[PDB]
Design a protein around this ligand. Structure first.
Ligand code: CLA
Ligand code: CLA
Ligand code: CLA
Ligand code: CLA
Ligand code: CLA
Ligand code: CLA
Ligand SMILES: CCCCCCCCCCCCCCCC(=O)OC[C@H](CO[C@@H]1O[C@H](CS(=O)(=O)O)[C@@H](O)[C@H](O)[C@H]1O)OC(=O)CCCCCCCCCCCCCCC
Ligand SMILES: CCCCCCCCCCCCCCCC(=O)OC[C@H](COP(=O)(O)OC[C@@H](O)CO)OC(=O)CCCCCCCCCCCCCCC
Ligand SMILES: CC1=C(/C=C/C(C)=C\C=C\C(C)=C/C=C/C=C(C)/C=C/C=C(C)/C=C/C2=C(C)C(=O)CCC2(C)C)C(C)(C)CCC1
Ligand SMILES: CC1=C(/C=C/C(C)=C/C=C/C(C)=C/C=C/C=C(C)/C=C/C=C(C)/C=C/C2=C(C)CCCC2(C)C)C(C)(C)CCC1
Ligand SMILES: CC1=C(/C=C/C(C)=C\C=C\C(C)=C\C=C\C=C(C)\C=C\C=C(C)\C=C\C2=C(C)CCCC2(C)C)C(C)(C)CCC1
Ligand code: SF4
Ligand code: SF4
Ligand SMILES: [Ca+2]
Ligand SMILES: [Ca+2]
Ligand SMILES: [Ca+2]
Ligand SMILES: [Mg+2]
Lengths: 80, 731, 40, 154, 141, 31
């Protein structure tokens, strides 16, 4: 399964989760930013690695990072 | 679906798709990323693999010797090496018909046969071998040597005999042994063989295992070497009318320095060759006494590196000893770069200064050797830069190399890459401009309006070595010069060999050579640009500041931040491979067209038509295909049939690679989804199900496989053309 | 296809063994090996 | 643990030893994958493969050393000898199974039953006849095989 | 997870739906309520009709279910936001998946534990040479 | 003189030694 990490430059704009087509990420309470929220990746077993989240990120170089890893039926996006 | 293979990566072995197999093949030799790999186990597995690889080399050489001795015509080809075609091995193919059987029953053989272009007959003959018995004995001995190295590799995987990491990192001792023993003692042994077998056997004196202990290579024994005077070993050198393999005009000398070419064999003098090997043996032995080991005297490489600082270079070479000795990728890059340099050197020297008897007259083998070695050198250079990039990805420590030369190179990488880009643009614009100007000016019927730049620099250089054609009269070309008034024993022979337009020694050059040299400069600079920019941005750029976290090779970083295809340093290697092939194409086209003109006595064709690109297109490529493409015909078949078939085969493989290079993955994965659906819903075929899920090839895999096809087609197409054209004209 | 070289009966059977038997056998062994669902 | 010989299956008191010939990785893998022991196979397939191999190689002895070797019927004689020896071997296999699996049937492996052993005998018979006949047919037609291998018909 | 209820959408069939993976490996379910019988686009191709009331539909992947869910909540005049997505195994086990805690993941909800969070910047990952011959990568340490 | 029938056959027998050693080396490197 791919790895998804969220670093402390997160502004909590929620576009991470809004872009995910597989519900890997969540908005969880935090205190580092004004929005009092941060992105989390509790369900990376369903991640396919399309990179939509990072495409949505505004911070100067991403606060969310997807590193493709061990390929499974789910991560390869297989319907068969 | 638990799946063992590959046992070194659980990530791959858990992949439920066909990818698992492909990647299993593609990552087996990347020991560093195996599950549980240590540094010591890494060095040890690499040691055993080295032993196995050396054994493979010895077995390949055994096969060459054995097939020449079994199915060849070595002994016949010795009788008349200028009119008999040397034989590689026998053909056995049930697909053949009568036409091909008759066409390949050649070179005087009674069965189908291939003509050898490896130059191996000339090599074995100049060595001193003259019978199939000696070749067979050498082949069997190499069988035994390969066995020895296979056993050594096996033995050094056993617990007691596994060398330690400190032993692998003992750089000073290994350098002493490789300079003194591997280089020096071996060169001394080859000087000894030449003096004992090659030189006598060239004079009708059979010297073998059954008499070499009793027949001195010189009438005056070793005492002249032990007492004082060595000029006796220069004695009476072989006269200009020496007939190779006979006593006619033969002498007794063993070490000479008369330079030039043996008049009959048109190659370097055997005595000069043995003397060279002896001298460089002494030098390499002395070199192997520089670094300390177990006796206090000697040098510490760490000290020498830490002692070469600089007022304008910061920390100099400090800590480069550990930087190099801790990175197998740094050392491998050094090795591949130096090896590619010396392979190109081999190529540029063996065609100009051949050392094997009657090989300068074998045009197909000479062309094939030059092309072969230059291609090998190009591959080596690309690999050296690839592994420099891999070093930066995996091994570079910025705090240990802080402010030293490595980090400082990294610190102005923008300037390096930018100026490489500038000189690339310079060369490209202006060389293409001159070529296209010449094309248009000749096309419109005014060939006198071309821009024909005389290559005065290289001509002046040739003049510095005695070449009096251009009339510069500088240094060696000037008899009044102090470089000529030295009394050197090699000057007369060197001048006679360089001032005769019958060899390849410093071939005459004109504007076509100028233009193609600037094309070569463009190709070298562009390939270096791709490789260096990949290496320096391997750890990061403004598009990917964290690229080192992703590894040397990876598909991309997605359509975001503008799009990031071919963003990795592996991708830079892949892109530079095309420019490597292009540069080699220009280089080898150059060599072959010029040597065709030279061998045929018509240098004017190249001199007059190489200045415009239609000249290459028509007089070189288009013309020299006529026999090639006629290897098989509606009217019959001849001995060039195999090369015509291989020519078309190389075209087909090249074009197939284009598919993997242009069409990308998603299109294929969706098509394969339709095909998967069809299989699941077809009765009878239903009974069968796949063990691995079929999926399209991966992004990186597509680049690799497309490049592999492209390169295979490139090499086979050009080899077919080169071989067939040169053997149809002169073979 | 004939052979004046010594032991020219060797290619007669060696060509089918190197071209048919060795490839088929080795591909079968590798197919079985890379599909073995042991442990990992 | 430099010793290459150890107890069999970790039991020093069972009448056997673990040696490079008896219980090594190569022997385990090779013997265990012969048709007799290959995992999952049905008795008739084991028998068929074994019979193929045996009928094939049993052609040779009488072909080259039998009484008809010096006659115009050498290959036919070798064929007949092979077929008859395979018939006697099949009767032997069938009778063995007949007497060894009389009562209750074990559940371990299908080969070690009455039905399974008879199926193995049927497979052996068929494969042995077939292999003997194909060896005889190759020898009888050695000339066309020669022309095929030399490309004489192109 | 008790027992999935809801009528299947009115649909004439297609070749783009479930394959062998559904019975051998895993499949996915999405339920939702509609205020009206109305047309929607199948993620597997073509048009289908959702029933007034509860609806239950089986698809091959989680992504197809979430694509249908976005279509439901962003392409109908009164939105459909009550859809639930489950994973279904051949044993019959049903694993509720989405929305994980009854609240869509785009908005903060108390009780969620941060996963995959790093207390550093991307630029503050360690040098790979410092972690080589380990199993980790700079983002895993 | 040409190569002998026996010299060709003796070559394969000798080559049996590096074959066995290569088998051992390969299987050891698999560990
Ligand atoms: C005098 C002692 C000695 C000698 C004989 C060697 C010899 C060798 N060592 Mg070793 N080594 C030694 C001591 C020695 N070692 C010690 C003390 C250490 C510990 C400090 C090491 C540790 C060490 C390691 C870790 C490794 C080696 C390896 C090797 C092999 C290098 C690969 C090769 O075959 O290229 C042979 C090269 C030449 C013969 C000369 C180089 C080529 C010249 C420069 C250019 C070409 C020559 C000529 C122009 C071309 C001829 C063309 C021809 C066709 C006509 C080599 C045979 C490597 C190996 O392969 O392991 C098996 C390896 O991994 N060594
Ligand atoms: C002695 C020199 C040497 C050494 C030991 C290494 C060692 C290594 N290299 Mg390197 N490299 C070299 C030379 C060398 N390389 C050269 C010359 C090049 C330029 C081509 C490269 C470019 C390079 C790149 C870009 C990469 C490596 C990688 C690697 C590592 C993984 C190897 C692997 O598993 O690949 C697997 C091997 C293969 C897939 C072989 C397939 C190619 C075959 C031989 C060609 C097939 C020809 C085909 C059959 C034609 C038939 C003709 C017929 C039809 C007529 C490994 C540590 C990889 C790595 O791990 O990065 C860290 C990596 O990505 N190397
Ligand atoms: C004939 C094929 C071709 C051509 C012309 C080029 C062109 C170029 N490549 Mg490229 N390349 C090619 C094939 C080709 N490539 C292939 C197959 C690959 C493998 C994928 C690559 C991969 C590659 C890489 C990775 C890189 C290059 C680089 C370069 C530039 C090198 C510098 C130079 O030559 O300056 C001069 C430019 C030229 C000679 C080409 C332009 C010629 C035109 C006629 C100029 C005139 C302008 C024209 C009038 C514009 C008006 C058009 C109007 C009619 C519409 C150059 C622009 C390197 C680079 O960018 O250098 C900085 C670089 O990094 N190439
Ligand atoms: C790498 C060396 C090499 C190569 C490229 C060849 C090439 C060839 N051989 Mg030859 N052979 C070799 C060595 C080699 N030989 C040696 C040393 C011997 C003496 C034992 C022989 C004895 C031999 C016989 C009797 C015959 C051939 C024949 C042939 C041709 C068909 C192959 C075949 O059916 O025979 C199979 C070859 C063998 C049974 C001998 C084993 C080859 C060596 C010892 C092992 C090489 C292993 C290699 C290095 C591993 C590389 C793997 C790599 C891809 C990773 C073919 C062109 C046939 C022929 O005459 O053509 C018309 C033929 O009948 N060879
Ligand atoms: C790898 C080397 C190789 C060799 C040696 C051959 C040789 C041959 N090819 Mg082939 N071919 C090859 C590769 C090769 N091919 C490849 C790579 C391709 C394309 C991908 C082709 C595609 C090709 C086609 C399309 C055709 C051939 C055909 C032929 C055969 C023509 C003669 C014939 O008609 O009898 C046929 C010979 C046999 C079928 C082999 C029989 C050998 C024995 C007698 C079989 C029985 C043995 C016994 C029962 C089992 C042994 C037990 C134990 C001792 C091991 C011939 C034997 C033609 C053909 O098959 O003719 C019918 C044909 O149509 N070739
Ligand atoms: C009393 C002892 C004895 C005697 C005297 C013989 C006598 C004979 N044996 Mg036998 N053998 C014996 C014991 C004996 N064997 C034992 C103990 C074994 C081990 C169990 C074998 C196993 C053996 C095999 C495997 C073969 C023989 C064969 C032969 C015959 C070869 C002579 C010949 O035809 O020359 C000329 C050579 C030939 C006719 C070679 C045939 C061509 C082969 C079949 C090509 C197959 C290769 C190819 C890769 C097949 C794959 C195709 C596939 C892709 C479909 C001969 C009559 C051969 C035979 O029966 O020929 C049909 C043969 O295949 N023997
Ligand atoms: C041109 C000629 C060149 C010189 C002549 C060389 C030819 C002679 C080679 C002799 C090989 C004999 C093979 C049979 C014995 C065998 O396999 O033992 C294998 C065992 C390994 O045991 C292993 O031991 C392992 C455990 S431990 O490591 O012992 O703890 C265990 O796991 C494993 O099962 C076991 O096998 O090896 C030994 O223990 C000693 C090997 C003896 C080899 C002598 C070689 C002579 C040196 C000459 C060359 C030196 C050059 C070096 C510098 C360049
Ligand atoms: C036609 C071929 C030439 C084109 C090559 C590419 C263009 C070169 C333009 C690069 C300018 C470099 C600016 C240096 C920046 C600079 O001034 O660094 C500072 C440095 C002063 O520090 P030091 O000399 O004390 O450092 C040397 C070490 O001891 C300390 O690390 O000056 C030099 O090194 C002068 C040598 C420059 C080396 C030039 C590179 C080309 C060398 C070619 C090979 C020389 C012969 C080698 C024989 C073994
Ligand atoms: C006691 C001893 C001495 C006496 C030594 C005597 C009495 C003989 C010495 C022989 C020596 C020391 C070396 C002989 C080496 C021969 C070698 C090493 C052969 C190497 C061949 C290689 C490597 C491969 C060759 C290839 C083959 C096989 C081919 O057939 C084709 C070409 C090629 C592929 C190259 C003296 C008193 C002097 C000094 C004191 C010690
Ligand atoms: C990436 C990288 C890298 C790199 C790599 C490479 C690939 C390199 C190279 C390079 C090269 C490829 C170089 C070249 C060179 C050359 C030279 C350096 C030369 C010399 C010269 C001279 C000086 C000569 C002279 C002379 C003459 C001319 C003639 C007469 C004689 C005399 C001697 C006088 C490394 C790994 C390291 C690190 C990491 C990164
Ligand atoms: C090398 C080696 C070895 C050995 C081996 C041997 C000793 C042998 C075998 C051999 C054999 C022993 C073979 C065989 C073959 C057989 C076959 C191939 C068969 C067949 C059959 C067929 C083909 C068919 C037939 C038929 C039928 C059944 C029906 C009708 C009639 C007919 C005829 C059609 C081992 C592995 C141990 C080890 C390693 C090395
Ligand atoms: S991952 Fe980046 S873009 Fe997405 S919510 Fe977090 S900080 Fe915002
Ligand atoms: S890579 Fe794609 S699937 Fe994975 S978290 Fe990002 S948007 Fe979701
Ligand atoms: Ca001799
Ligand atoms: Ca009789
Ligand atoms: Ca025919
Ligand atoms: Mg030379």
């Amino acid at each position: 399964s791919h790895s998804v990490k969220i670093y402390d430059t997160c502004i909590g704009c929620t576009q991470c989760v809004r872009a995910c087509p597989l519900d890997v990420l969540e908005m969880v309470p935090w205190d580092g930013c004004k929005a009092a929220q941060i992105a989390s990746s509790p369900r990376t077993e369903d991640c396919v690695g399309c990179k939509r989240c990072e495409t949505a990120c505004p911070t100067d170089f991403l606060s969310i990072r997807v590193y493709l890893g061990a390929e499974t039926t789910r991560s390869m996006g297989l319907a068969y | 679906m638990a799946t063992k293979f590959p046992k070194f990566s659980q990530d791959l072995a858990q992949d439920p798709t066909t990818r698992r197999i492909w990647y299993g093949i593609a990552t087996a030799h990347d020991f560093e990323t195996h599950d549980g790999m240590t540094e010591e186990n890494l060095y040890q597995k690499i040691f055993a693999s080295h032993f196995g690889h050396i054994a493979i080399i010895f077995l390949w050489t055994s096969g060459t010797l054995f097939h020449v001795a079994w199915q060849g015509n070595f002994e016949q080809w010795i009788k008349d090496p200028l009119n008999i075609r040397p034989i590689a091995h026998a053909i056995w193919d049930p697909h053949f018909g009568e036409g091909a059987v008759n066409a390949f029953t050649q070179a005087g053989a009674s069965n189908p046969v291939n003509i050898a272009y490896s130059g191996v007959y000339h090599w074995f003959y100049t060595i001193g071998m003259t019978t199939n018995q000696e070749l067979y004995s050498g082949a069997v001995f190499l069988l035994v040597l390969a066995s020895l190295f296979l056993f050594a590799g096996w033995l050094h995987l056993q617990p007691k005999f596994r060398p330690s990491l400190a032993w692998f990192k003992n750089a000073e001792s290994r350098l002493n042994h490789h300079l003194a023993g591997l280089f020096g003692v071996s060169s001394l042994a080859w000087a000894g063989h030449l003096v004992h077998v090659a030189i006598p056997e060239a004079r009708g004196q059979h010297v073998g295992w059954d008499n070499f202990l009793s027949t001195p290579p010189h009438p005056a024994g070793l005492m002249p070497f032990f007492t004082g005077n060595w000029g006796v070993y220069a004695a009476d050198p072989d006269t200009a009318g020496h007939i190779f393999g006979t006593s006619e005009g033969a002498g007794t000398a063993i070490l000479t320095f008369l330079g030039g070419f043996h008049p009959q064999t048109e190659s370097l003098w055997l005595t000069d060759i043995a003397h060279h090997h002896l001298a460089i043996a002494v030098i390499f032995i002395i070199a192997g006494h520089m670094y300390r080991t177990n006796w206090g005297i000697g040098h510490s490489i760490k000290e020498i590196l830490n002692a070469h600082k600089g007022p304008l270079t910061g920390a100099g070479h400090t800590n480069l000893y550990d930087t190099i000795n801790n990175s197998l990728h740094f050392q491998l890059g050094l090795a591949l770069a130096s090896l590619g340099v010396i392979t190109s050197l081999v190529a540029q020297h063996m065609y100009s200064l051949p050392s094997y008897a009657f090989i300068a007259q074998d045009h197909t083998t000479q062309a094939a050797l030059y092309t072969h070695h230059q291609y090998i050198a190009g591959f080596l250079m690309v690999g050296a830069f690839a592994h420099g990039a891999i070093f930066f990805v995996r091994d570079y420590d910025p705090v240990a190399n802080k402010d030293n030369v490595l980090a400082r190179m990294l610190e102005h990488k923008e300037a390096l890459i930018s100026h490489l880009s500038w000189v690339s643009l310079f060369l490209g614009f202006h060389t293409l401009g001159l070529y296209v100007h010449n094309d248009v000016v000749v096309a419109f019927g005014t060939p006198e309006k071309q821009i024909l730049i005389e290559p005065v620099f290289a001509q002046w250089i040739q003049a510095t070595s005695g070449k009096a054609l251009y009339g510069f009269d500088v240094l060696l070309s000037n008899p009044d010069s102090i470089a000529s008034t030295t009394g050197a024993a090699w000057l007369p022979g060197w001048l006679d060999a360089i001032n005769s337009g019958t060899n390849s020694l410093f071939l005459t050059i004109g504007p076509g050579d100028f233009l193609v040299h600037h094309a070569i400069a463009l190709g070298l600079h562009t390939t270096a640009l791709i490789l260096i920019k990949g290496a320096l941005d391997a750890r990061g750029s403004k598009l990917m500041p964290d690229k080192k976290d992703f590894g040397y090779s990876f598909p991309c970083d997605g359509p975001g931040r503008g799009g990031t295809c071919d963003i990795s340093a592996w991708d830079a290697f892949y892109l530079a491979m095309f420019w490597m092939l292009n540069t080699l194409g220009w280089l080898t086209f150059y060599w072959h067209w010029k040597h065709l003109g030279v061998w045929s006595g018509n240098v004017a064709q190249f001199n007059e038509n190489s200045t415009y690109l239609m000249g290459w297109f028509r007089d070189y490529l288009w013309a020299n295909s006529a026999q090639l493409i006629n290897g098989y015909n509606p009217y019959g078949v001849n001995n060039l049939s195999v090369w015509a078939w291989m020519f078309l085969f190389g075209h087909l493989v090249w074009a197939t690679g284009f598919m993997f290079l242009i069409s990308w993955r998603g299109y294929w994965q969706e098509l394969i989804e339709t095909i998967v659906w069809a299989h699941e819903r077809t009765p009878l075929a239903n009974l069968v199900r796949w063990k691995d899920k079929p999926v399209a090839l991966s992004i990186v895999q597509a680049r690799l496989v497309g490049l592999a096809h492209f390169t295979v087609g490139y090499v086979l197409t050009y080899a077919a053309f080169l071989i067939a054209s040169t053997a149809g004209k002169f073979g | 296809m004939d052979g004046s070289y010594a032991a020219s009966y060797l290619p007669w059977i060696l060509i089918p063994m190197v071209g048919w038997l060795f490839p088929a056998v080795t591909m079968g062994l590798l197919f079985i090996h890379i599909e073995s669902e042991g442990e990992g | 643990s430099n010793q290459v010989v150890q107890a069999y299956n970790g039991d020093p008191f069972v009448g056997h030893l673990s040696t490079p010939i008896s219980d090594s990785a190569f022997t385990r893998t090779f013997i265990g994958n012969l048709p007799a022991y290959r995992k999952g196979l049905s008795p008739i397939l084991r028998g068929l493969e074994v019979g193929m191999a045996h009928g094939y190689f049993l052609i040779g002895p009488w072909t080259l050393l039998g009484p008809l070797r010096d006659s115009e019927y050498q290959y036919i004689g070798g064929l007949i000898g092979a077929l008859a020896l395979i018939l006697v071997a099949t009767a032997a296999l069938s009778s063995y199974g007949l007497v060894t699996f009389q009562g209750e049937q074990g559940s371990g492996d299908t080969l070690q039953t009455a039905d399974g052993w008879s199926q193995f005998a049927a497979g052996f018979f068929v494969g042995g006849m077939g292999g003997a006949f194909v060896a005889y047919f190759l020898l009888e037609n050695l000339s066309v095989v020669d022309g095929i291998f030399r490309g004489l018909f192109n | 997870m008790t027992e999935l209820s809801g009528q299947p959408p009115k649909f004439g069939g297609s070749t783009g739906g479930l394959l062998s993976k559904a019975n051998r490996e895993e499949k996915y379910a999405i339920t939702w309520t509609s205020a009206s019988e109305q047309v929607f686009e199948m993620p597997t191709g073509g048009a289908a009709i959702m029933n007034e009331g509860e609806n239950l539909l089986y698809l091959a992947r989680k992504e197809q279910c979430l694509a249908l869910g976005t279509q439901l909540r962003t392409k109908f005049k009164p939105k459909i936001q009550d859809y639930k997505i489950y994973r279904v195994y051949p044993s019959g086990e049903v694993q509720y998946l989405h929305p994980a805690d009854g609240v869509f993941p785009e908005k903060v909800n108390e009780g969620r534990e941060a996963q995959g969070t790093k207390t550093r910047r991307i630029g503050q990952n360690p040098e790979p040479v410092t972690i080589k011959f380990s199993g980790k990568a700079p983002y895993e340490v | 003189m040409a190569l002998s029938d026996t010299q060709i056959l003796a070559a394969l027998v000798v080559a049996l030694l590096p074959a066995f050693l290569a088998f051992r080396l390969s299987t050891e490197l698999y560990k």
